[PDB]
Amino acid sequence: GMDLDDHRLSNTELEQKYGTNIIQGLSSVRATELLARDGPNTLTPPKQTPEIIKFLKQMVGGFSILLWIGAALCWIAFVIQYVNNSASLDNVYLGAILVLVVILTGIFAYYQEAKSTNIMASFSKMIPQQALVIRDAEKKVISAEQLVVGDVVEIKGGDQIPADIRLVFSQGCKVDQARSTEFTHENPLETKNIGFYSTTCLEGTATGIVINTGDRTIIGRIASLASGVGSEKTPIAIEIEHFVHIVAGVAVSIDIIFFITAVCMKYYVLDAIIFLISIIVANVPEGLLATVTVTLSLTAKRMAKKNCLVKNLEAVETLGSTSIICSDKTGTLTQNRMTVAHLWFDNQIFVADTSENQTKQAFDQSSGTWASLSKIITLCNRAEFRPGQESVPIMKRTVVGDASETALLKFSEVILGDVMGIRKRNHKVAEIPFNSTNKFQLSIHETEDPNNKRFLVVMKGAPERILEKCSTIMINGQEQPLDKSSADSFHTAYMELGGLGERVLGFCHLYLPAEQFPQSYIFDVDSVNFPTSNFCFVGLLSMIDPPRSTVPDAVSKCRSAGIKVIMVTGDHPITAKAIAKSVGIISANNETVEDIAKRRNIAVEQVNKREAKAAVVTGMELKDMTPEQLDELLTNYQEIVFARTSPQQKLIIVEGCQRQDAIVAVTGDGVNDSPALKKADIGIAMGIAGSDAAKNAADMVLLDDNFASIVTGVEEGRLIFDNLKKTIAYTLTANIAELCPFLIYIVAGLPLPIGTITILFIDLGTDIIPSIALAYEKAESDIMNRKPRHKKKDRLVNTQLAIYSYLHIGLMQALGGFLVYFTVYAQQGFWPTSLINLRVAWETDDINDLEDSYGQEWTRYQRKYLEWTGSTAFFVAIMIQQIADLIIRKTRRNSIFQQGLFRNKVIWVGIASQVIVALILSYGLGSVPALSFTMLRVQYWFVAVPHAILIWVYDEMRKLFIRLYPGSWWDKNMYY
Amino acid sequence: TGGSWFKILLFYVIFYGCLAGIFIGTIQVMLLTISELKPTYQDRVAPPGLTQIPQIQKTEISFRPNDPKSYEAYVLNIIRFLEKYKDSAQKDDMIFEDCGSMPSEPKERGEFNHERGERKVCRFKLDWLGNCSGLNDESYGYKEGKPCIIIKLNRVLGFKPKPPKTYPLTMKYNPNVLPVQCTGKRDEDKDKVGNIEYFGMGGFYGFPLQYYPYYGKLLQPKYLQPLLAVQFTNLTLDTEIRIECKAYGENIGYSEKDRFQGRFDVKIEVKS
Ligand SMILES: CCCCCCCC/C=C/CCCCCCCC(=O)OC[C@H](COP(=O)(O)OCC[N+](C)(C)C)OC(=O)CCCCCCC/C=C/CCCCCCCC
Ligand SMILES: Nc1ncnc2c1ncn2[C@@H]1O[C@H](COP(=O)(O)OP(=O)(O)CP(=O)(O)O)[C@@H](O)[C@H]1O
Ligand SMILES: CC(C)CCC[C@@H](C)[C@H]1CC[C@H]2[C@@H]3CC=C4C[C@@H](O)CC[C@]4(C)[C@H]3CC[C@]12C
Ligand SMILES: *[C@@H]1O[C@H](CO)[C@@H](O)[C@H](O)[C@H]1NC(C)=O
Ligand code: NA
Ligand code: NA
């Protein structure tokens, strides 16, 4: 529709713009017409594909085109063979099973994005939602479906806004944001006079006019306009596309080389055509989508168990590539359970017991300075104890207020007596709730003293801004102006009380004169009325905010794994730095430019900035820079603490960080952080203490409201890529040991080492279950010692992985199979050098007296049976050479002695499946000779074992020098 | 680069020369358990097959007597095999041994080792194959409507046939003769096969047992099999006739999947 919302206009012209009325709304004859013009206003998900195109797309896609080409080649081969008047029907079974494979992969794909969707559907947050309200002047119950432009709606707190309206009448309504009747901000999201559909309404009565419906709404836009939104490819989809391209290129190159060899060397078209289908059925990983959709579900369950409630799929795929984290201080990095331990008044430092005090304060309670401070602390506090539970100690009692308020309540109740009576005596008319923007909690009290001052104003807030608005200090019950000896004393006290990593609060009070202010007065929030400056500052409250226990380990693991951590707290650049140094964000042996200037005993500007690695920059500091300066600050300096920063400036921080080819993961818990929680690659909503707007705008939700969850989400986001490189390598290993036999059969003329159905049985039986068994593997020891993966530079299947799968382990699985093949043939009469150039005579149905190396004469069916036994021996050899090819693929840098052979018990299921399938195929399907299988003697199972105790030794000694000699051309070259 | 390619082309020389040295170093280890005299196992060749010499292609003998070229290959292929049984190629006495003209017990020439070295074969004479030896008729019967096939039992090393202890031959001599009987495969072929005349050694229709056991191309080169020649002296003209020949014994086995194990099937057609 349009990109602009009509909100600047006043009520008189807001009535004209869309034809509405402020009070009476519109009559039925006009409201019905407007509703028909606009339509219904509801949020539904029902749009979905007609699903016929979806079945068609899942029918052929990626690997399916190659396999369909192979099936067509197989049918062509059968018809060509039938031209020669011979029909062994082996191609019919191969083609039927090959098509059945695609049918089953389509069935498994329909199973996919359904169980994953069911897992996906569970990761979602509700808000109390209802669409019933009484509105439109006359008190009538009108459904939300009848709300349209021209109709006024009166709303009440405790539900969601029935429609996207522009508020015209309201009385101090609040949403999660103040609501008023006056235009405040140009942006409709923060204009403070527009209601948002499906957004909670806290309290108060508000009246507004609908301005958008359906597609016209900001949230909806093209919701009802169909089209495709959200179909962006996940990173694993890109990796799978690259893998498909690599596989197709390799297969095409091999086929072209063989065809150009066969065209001139007199190989008839049937051999070439059957070699192409062999190549197609061999070099195509069939059971890959199953082990791909298993891994993501398993990792989602793992993180959900690790308090990491990842909602989207792009989030779980992209989490392991995190490079920059912009976390908060209170909440994520601290226990958020403050304890009062230090006191400051009369320019002195007074200590107190953090917990289990069980006694009164050490200092005297009759001091004139302490009496007023304690009285104001008790009065200024808003925290209240948990009702109905006045038997548990003070600590166990719960408050729905701020944690700092709980701290002052805990101090006051254990130091002073009853506070309810004092608050009742100091009757309160109006009170300004504490907010992050104002950073003070203003209150209005009526004086009950004999001197009828009748006006008492008490507030608390940040000590720096408190004293910046104060011009006097109080000592020994006597007021005195704030001289330099008091300002410097306050600065020194703040530095000392922030050095240990504790936040402090200021306190003030004032009584208005009776002559200037009469007994009867009216208080307005907007109007200044009572003065709010030059109050009576009393003292400071020091409260300890200890970081959570697991946080330092997480910050050290981030340093080890090369993940940058940034703090975006809004506190003083001294306390933020002092707590960052404690949690490890600003590591030891690191010095900001101010501290290195102090050490050099010279001014800051006389110090080269490169001599400093840390940065504690205030909010105004980055408010004053152009984006280039912010980019160079984020580039040149390692550890950055964005202290004293606005919550909105998280936008600037995140958008500056993202311009460095890095993946950012910001953590916000407020509706102010939601625009920054959306721009971030992985927006994170604080778990226990968080707002639903953040939990809706975040790509990932915590459940432990703690750091070290954001890092244990990365540690299992990396496990996806670690276990996929182990699943795409074991599969590719046995791919050249299935087409080398046919190459030698064509060239050297040996009888067929392995059939075409056999190399498909290998893929179906010993390539699926062991492939899934490698997706359950645990993490390595170097998973948190590796730099974050680059989305463009790094690939799931690099050149080294494919070269090691094909040219290293695939060539050792063929030499072991050929040994068993030659053993089977040589023990029945045909010596190894007697088999060269024998295929022409071997496959002639008319030669029933072929002479072996001992002079005996073999009929055709006995040669056929010996060939079947030789192929069964090759199949068994590559079932046992892929048991030591699944043990050595559980690691890429470690050994089995450290990982443990019995720690992952699905590897044993995969091994037992291989053994059971190989025993069924040779003794159950070989008792009646069918599908080129025959019973195998007991020796022909253990012949390939010595070649399987070689693949393991070679890989163990390959990884041993990787571990011993990092970055020594061995880690550089021989490391997949 | 230009200098680090020599370090990657040198690892793959040593690694692929070590894989080859391990593959060859295990094939020669397996071959140490393989004797040069007798096969390790006789599992596929143990029950000997039975085949005809003309090496006819599709189990079909079709020719026309008045066309010297329809049976030209049939007659010319018997000559190639019977050349080694020529009486002029058996004159040497350092190799050939003259057994009797009557069947006797299997002739044991020793043990499967290097004692006595080369072993002496027993000579077979063509003129036992009357009307089919080619000593009188240059074409082996194909000039007229009398096809003549020559039956031979596939050589199995160390195998001694045991004749049975069908119809009795009426010239039994089963202690030293393995019976062979050719009959029509179907009733409409038994009615049309006509008269079948066998030509074996000493007038006995079978393989004499004195040519067994075979000793295997190293102890016994120049080894001559016993042959049985079968002539169909009177069969239906211009018809495809199916004929099945079987060797009877207790060593001899028959299989439903191997059509040439102890048996063979040949379709004889004579056109006019
Ligand atoms: C990319 C593909 C990877 C997988 C490839 C696997 C190999 C596939 C090749 C097949 C071709 C045929 C291989 C033949 C092997 C012969 C083994 C050998 O050594 O027999 C030596 C022979 C004599 O044996 P015999 O029959 O008398 O023994 C009978 C037993 N007894 C001793 C009691 C008499 O000597 C002679 O005949 C000398 C005259 C003939 C010489 C032929 C030489 C052929 C050698 C080929 C080795 C190639 C190795 C490739 C490695 C690639 C690694 C990447
Ligand atoms: N109810 C209340 N009334 C007055 N001041 C309060 C208050 N609750 C907290 N404060 C002030 O807030 C400060 C505590 O900081 P806080 O932990 O809220 O920072 P923060 O976590 O909101 C920054 P961010 O959200 O970016 O992580 C104290 O110095 C205190 O003076
Ligand atoms: C089969 C035998 C003859 C192969 C001989 C050529 C071999 C040694 C050559 C051909 C292609 C080469 C590879 C081509 C590309 C890559 C990727 C690069 O980042 C490192 C080198 C590496 C990994 C090369 C290693 C050596 C290599 C495998
Ligand atoms: C076939 O042999 C018989 C004697 O058994 C003989 O009378 C006849 O002439 C022979 N025929 C030919 C074509 O040699
Ligand atoms: Na494979
Ligand atoms: Na495989």
One-character DSSP codes across A881-926: TTTHHHHTTS-SSS-HHHH-SSSSTHHHHHHHHHHHHHHHHHHTST
Question: Active site includes A483?
Answer: no
Residue A451 CA from chain centroid, whole number:
62
Q: How far is Cα A958 from Cα A964, in angstroms, rounded to an integer?
A: 10
Going by C-beta distance under 8 Å and a sequence separation of 6 or more, which residues neighbour residue B149?
B52, B53, B54, B61, B229, B230, B266
Bridge partners of residue A169, in order along the sequence = A207
Nearest to B41 by CA among A856, A973, A365, A147: A856
- Note which residues in 143-172 of chain B have CB less than 8 A from chain A: 152, 154-157
Atom of ligand 1 minimally distant from the CA of B35: 33
Residue reference for tokens 């390939």: A944
Atom of ligand 1 minimally distant from the CA of A740: 2
3-state DSSP assignment of residue A665: strand
**Structural contact between residues A331 and A398, judged by C-beta atoms closer than 8 angstroms:** no
Q: How far is Cα A615 from Cα B108, in angstroms, rounded to an integer?
A: 102
Which amino acid, one-letter code, is at B222?
K
**Structural contact between residues A528 and A521, judged by C-beta atoms closer than 8 angstroms:** no
Nearest to A156 by CA among A176, A180, A132, A128: A132
A254 alpha carbon – ligand 5 mean position (Å):
16
Atom of ligand 4 minimally distant from the CA of B197: 5
Nearest to A865 among B27, B31, B44 (CB): B44
Residues in chain B: 272
A811 lines ligand 1 (CB under 6 A): yes
**Structural contact between residues A799 and A731, judged by C-beta atoms closer than 8 angstroms:** no
3-state DSSP assignment of residue A496: helix
Around A592, how many Cα atoms within 13 Å sit in the side-chain half-sphere? Answer: 18
Bridge partners of residue A408, in order along the sequence = none
Nearest to A657 by CA among A672, A640, A673, A645: A640
Contact B57 A822 (CB under 8 A): no
Q: How far is Cα A436 from Cα A596, in angstroms, rounded to an integer?
A: 33
Contact A859 B51 (CB under 8 A): yes
Q: How far is Cα A134 from Cα A154, in angstroms, rounded to an integer?
A: 7
Sign of the four-CA dihedral A643, A645, A651, A655:
negative
Tokens of A201: 């309404």
* DSSP H/E element including A475: strand A472-475
Torsion (CA) A577, A581, A585, A591 in degrees, nearest 10: 70
Which amino acid, one-letter code, is at A97?
I
Which amino acid, one-letter code, is at B203?
G
**Structural contact between residues A163 and A149, judged by C-beta atoms closer than 8 angstroms:** no
Please tell me what resolution, in angstroms, this structure has. 3.1
- Note which residues in 35-74 of chain B have CB less than 8 A from chain A: 37-41, 43-45, 49, 51, 55-58
Q: How far is Cα A857 from Cα B261, in angstroms, rounded to an integer?
A: 11
How many Cβ atoms from other residues are within 10 Å of residue A807's Cβ? 13
Q: How far is Cα A127 from Cα B42, in angstroms, rounded to an integer?
A: 81
Q: Does B234 touch chain A (CB under 8 A)?
A: no
Query: Residue ranges of the alpha helices (H) in A547-702?
Result: 551-560, 575-583, 593-600, 619-623, 627-636, 650-657, 674-679, 692-697
* DSSP H/E element including A209: strand A205-210
**How do strand B228-234 and strand B195-199 relate by DSSP bridges?**
antiparallel
- A-chain CB neighbours of B38 within 8 Å are 854
**Structural contact between residues A146 and A35, judged by C-beta atoms closer than 8 angstroms:** yes
Mutate to test the pocket of ligand 1, among B12, B14, B19, B23 (most ligand atoms within 8 A of CB): B23
**Residue of chain A with shortest Cα separation from B154:** A857
Contact A862 B216 (CB under 8 A): no
* DSSP H/E element including A684: strand A684-685
- Rg of chain B over all Cα atoms, to the nearest angstrom: 24
Q: How far is Cα A311 from Cα A695, in angstroms, rounded to an integer?
A: 10
Q: How far is Cα A637 from Cα B112, in angstroms, rounded to an integer?
A: 88
Mutate to test the pocket of ligand 3, among A250, A743, A798, A799 (most ligand atoms within 8 A of CB): A799
Nearest to A937 by CA among A828, A818, A817, A815: A828
Torsion (CA) A311, A312, A318, A320 in degrees, nearest 10: 30
Experimental technique of record: cryo-EM
Atom of ligand 4 minimally distant from the CA of B131: 14
Nearest to A625 by CA among A593, A606, A649: A649
**Structural contact between residues A171 and A178, judged by C-beta atoms closer than 8 angstroms:** no
Contact B30 A823 (CB under 8 A): yes
Q: How far is Cα A339 from Cα A801, in angstroms, rounded to an integer?
A: 55
Tokens of A224: 């009802």
Q: How far is Cα A311 from Cα A701, in angstroms, rounded to an integer?
A: 7
Contact B44 A819 (CB under 8 A): no
Q: Does B80 touch chain A (CB under 8 A)?
A: no
CA distance A811 to chain B (A): 9
Query: Angle of helix A269-282 relative to helix A63-83, nearest 10 degrees?
Result: 150
A542 lines ligand 2 (CB under 6 A): no
Tokens of A8: 């600047």
Residue nearest to atom 11 of ligand 3 (CA): A803
Angle at A537 between CA A536 and CA A538, to 5 degrees: 110
**Structural contact between residues A698 and A206, judged by C-beta atoms closer than 8 angstroms:** no
Q: How far is Cα A700 from Cα A677, in angstroms, rounded to an integer?
A: 10
Contact B259 A861 (CB under 8 A): yes
Torsion (CA) A430, A434, A440, A442 in degrees, nearest 10: 10
Q: How far is Cα A73 from Cα A271, in angstroms, rounded to an integer?
A: 12
Contact A861 B156 (CB under 8 A): no
Q: How far is Cα A517 from Cα A396, in angstroms, rounded to an integer?
A: 44
Residue reference for tokens 């070259």: A973
**Structural contact between residues A509 and A458, judged by C-beta atoms closer than 8 angstroms:** yes
**Structural contact between residues A874 and A821, judged by C-beta atoms closer than 8 angstroms:** yes
Contact B217 A827 (CB under 8 A): no
Residue nearest to atom 6 of ligand 4 (CA): B131
Q: How far is Cα A146 from Cα A155, in angstroms, rounded to an integer?
A: 15
Residue reference for tokens 């207020």: A401
**Structural contact between residues A443 and A458, judged by C-beta atoms closer than 8 angstroms:** yes
- Catalytic-role residue among A5, A38, A328, A885: A328
CA distance A946 to chain B (A): 10
Q: Measured between alpha carbons, how far is residue A687 from residues A403, A526, A583, A702, A774 in Å?
A: 16, 35, 21, 4, 32
Q: Please give the interface size between A and B, counted as residue pairs whose CB atoms are below 8 Å apart.
A: 118
Considering every ligand atom shown, identify the ligand nearest to the alpha carbon of residue B19 and give its number: 1
Tokens of A827: 């023990």
Q: How far is Cα A556 from Cα A136, in angstroms, rounded to an integer?
A: 60
3-state DSSP assignment of residue A654: helix
Query: Residue ranges of the alpha helices (H) in A112-227?
Result: 115-122
Residues within 6 Å of ligand 3 by CB: A 799-800, 803; B 8-9, 12
A568 lines ligand 2 (CB under 6 A): yes
CA-based max dimension of chain B: 90
Q: Does B13 touch chain A (CB under 8 A)?
A: no
Residue reference for tokens 């919701």: A223
How many Cβ atoms from other residues are within 10 Å of residue A830's Cβ? 24
Residues of chain B immediately before an interruption (C to N > 2.5 Å): 165
* DSSP H/E element including A290: helix A289-305
Contact B45 A862 (CB under 8 A): yes
Q: How far is Cα A778 from Cα A714, in angstroms, rounded to an integer?
A: 14
Q: Does B261 touch chain A (CB under 8 A)?
A: yes
Nearest to A828 among B11, B26, B43 (CB): B43
Q: Which of B6, B23, B211 to mutate to test the interface with A (most CBs of A within 10 A)?
A: B23
Q: How far is Cα A352 from Cα A339, in angstroms, rounded to an integer?
A: 10
Atom of ligand 1 minimally distant from the CA of A834: 26
Torsion (CA) A418, A419, A425, A429 in degrees, nearest 10: -160
Residues in chain A: 976
Q: How far is Cα A716 from Cα A721, in angstroms, rounded to an integer?
A: 9
**Structural contact between residues A450 and A412, judged by C-beta atoms closer than 8 angstroms:** no
Nearest to B44 among A823, A858, A946 (CB): A858
A569 lines ligand 2 (CB under 6 A): yes
Give yes or no for a cis peptide into B213 (omega within 30° of 0).
Answer: yes
Torsion (CA) A783, A789, A795, A797 in degrees, nearest 10: 0
Q: Measured between alpha carbons, how far is residue A256 from residues A276, A396, A756, B266 in Å?
A: 9, 77, 20, 45
Which amino acid, one-letter code, is at A569?
T
Q: How far is Cα A373 from Cα A187, in angstroms, rounded to an integer?
A: 44
Residue reference for tokens 């979602």: A124
Nearest to A67 by CA among A56, A59, A77: A59
Q: How far is Cα A371 from Cα A408, in angstroms, rounded to an integer?
A: 15
How many Cβ atoms from other residues are within 10 Å of residue B85's Cβ? 19
A762 alpha carbon – ligand 3 mean position (Å):
28
Torsion (CA) A397, A398, A402, A403 in degrees, nearest 10: 60
Residue reference for tokens 């062999």: A278
Q: What string of H, E and C letters represents the secondary structure of A843-880?
A: CCCCCCCEECCCCCEECHHHHHHHHHHHHHHHHHHHHH
Residue reference for tokens 């399987």: A948
Backbone angles phi, psi at A342, to 5 degrees: -120, 150
Torsion (CA) A124, A129, A131, A134 in degrees, nearest 10: -160
Q: How far is Cα A328 from Cα A465, in angstroms, rounded to an integer?
A: 21
Going by C-beta distance under 8 Å and a sequence separation of 6 or more, which residues neighbour residue A765?
A879, A913, A914, A917, A918, A921
Q: What string of H, E and C letters represents the secondary structure of chain B?
A: CCCCCCCCCCHHHHHHHHHHHHHHHHHHHHHHHCCCCCCCCCCCCCCCEEEECCCCCCCEEEECCCCCCCCHHHHHHHHHHHHHHCHHHCCCCCCEECCCCCCCCCCCCCCCCCCCCCCCEECCCHHHCCCCCCCCCCCCCCCCCCCEEEEEECCCECCCCCCCCCCCCCCCCCCCEEEEEEEECCHHHHHHHCEEEEECHHHCCEEEHHHCCECCCCCCCCCCCCCEEEEEEECCCCCEEEEEEEECCCCCCCCCCCCCECEEEEEEEECC
**How do strand A159-160 and strand A200-203 relate by DSSP bridges?**
antiparallel
The long-range contacts involving A157-160, CB below 8 angstroms and separated by at least 24 positions, are A157/A201, A157/A202, A157/A203, A157/A204, A157/A205, A158/A128, A158/A201, A158/A202, A158/A203, A159/A128, A159/A129, A159/A130, A159/A133, A159/A200, A159/A201, A160/A127, A160/A128, A160/A129, A160/A130, A160/A197, A160/A198, A160/A199, A160/A200, A160/A201
Contact A861 B255 (CB under 8 A): yes
**Structural contact between residues A684 and A666, judged by C-beta atoms closer than 8 angstroms:** yes
**How do strand B263-270 and strand B195-199 relate by DSSP bridges?**
unpaired
**Structural contact between residues A515 and A385, judged by C-beta atoms closer than 8 angstroms:** no
Residues within 6 Å of ligand 4 by CB: B 130-131, 137
With 0-12 / 13-18 / 19 or more C-beta atoms within 10 angstroms meaning exposed / middle / buried, residue A181 is middle
3-state DSSP assignment of residue A18: helix
Going by C-beta distance under 8 Å and a sequence separation of 6 or more, which residues neighbour residue A263?
none
- Note which residues in 203-222 of chain B have CB less than 8 A from chain A: 214, 216-218, 220
Contact B23 A854 (CB under 8 A): no
Q: How far is Cα A923 from Cα A178, in angstroms, rounded to an integer?
A: 79
A440 alpha carbon – ligand 2 mean position (Å):
9
Sign of the four-CA dihedral A452, A455, A461, A466:
negative
Q: Measured between alpha carbons, how far is residue A517 from residues A444, A520, A532, A666 in Å?
A: 14, 8, 14, 50
**How do strand A324-327 and strand A664-668 relate by DSSP bridges?**
parallel
**How do strand A502-511 and strand A540-544 relate by DSSP bridges?**
antiparallel
Contact B49 A862 (CB under 8 A): yes
**Residue of chain B with shortest Cα separation from A812:** B19
Atom of ligand 3 minimally distant from the CA of B9: 8
- B-chain CB neighbours of A857 within 8 Å are 45, 49, 51, 154-156
Residues of chain A immediately before an interruption (C to N > 2.5 Å): 176
Going by C-beta distance under 8 Å and a sequence separation of 6 or more, which residues neighbour residue A693?
A176, A199, A670, A671, A674
Tokens of A631: 């980019």
B12 alpha carbon – ligand 3 mean position (Å):
9
Q: How far is Cα B126 from Cα A535, in angstroms, rounded to an integer?
A: 140
B187 alpha carbon – ligand 3 mean position (Å):
71
With 0-12 / 13-18 / 19 or more C-beta atoms within 10 angstroms meaning exposed / middle / buried, residue A229 is exposed
Q: How far is Cα A101 from Cα A67, in angstroms, rounded to an integer?
A: 9
**Structural contact between residues A556 and A563, judged by C-beta atoms closer than 8 angstroms:** no
Residue nearest to atom 34 of ligand 1 (CA): B36
Sign of the four-CA dihedral A233, A238, A243, A244:
positive
Going by C-beta distance under 8 Å and a sequence separation of 6 or more, which residues neighbour residue A485?
none
Angle at A640 between CA A635 and CA A646, to 5 degrees: 110
DSSP per-residue string spanning A95-137: HHHHHHHHHHHHHHHHHTTTHHHHHHHHS--------EEEETT
* DSSP H/E element including A257: helix A235-264
